[PDB]
Design a protein around this ligand. Structure first.
Ligand SMILES: *[C@@H]1O[C@H](CO)[C@@H](O)[C@H](O)[C@H]1NC(C)=O
Lengths: 49, 48
């Protein structure tokens, strides 16, 4: 699995709603091209992807 | 003799007088409150 050397989450225009109303961008500098599972570790916010 | 000068050259707020319906055109004097009901088709979601 590719290793994320550093990651930064910046989130703008969040709306708490039934629909996916929030959007966050992760900036990353990993070492190898590949697929990562993205997850939200809270019971209050759920990721679409 | 003593008509003075017409309202085309005397009227305040710099607006010009016409005579076919007798209207004062382009008077810049006050503030207009305005309310717009923009349709939802114009709005796009924050994702896009
Ligand atoms: C007509 O009006 C003018 C404009 O003031 C005035 O000076 C003049 O005496 C009047 N009479 C004639 C005959 O021009």
């Amino acid at each position: 699995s590719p290793t994320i050397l550093e990651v930064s989450c910046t989130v703008a225009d969040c709306i708490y709603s039934a629909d996916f109303g929030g959007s966050l961008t992760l900036q990353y500098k990993a070492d190898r091209e590949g697929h990562c599972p993205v997850h939200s570790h809270s019971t209050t916010a759920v990721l679409k992807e | 003799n003593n008509s003075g000068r017409p309202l085309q050259e005397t009227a305040p707020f710099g607006c010009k007088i016409e005579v076919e319906p007798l209207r004062a055109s382009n008077c810049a004097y006050g503030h207009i409150p305005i309310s717009i009901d923009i349709p939802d088709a114009a709005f796009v979601r924050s994702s896009e």
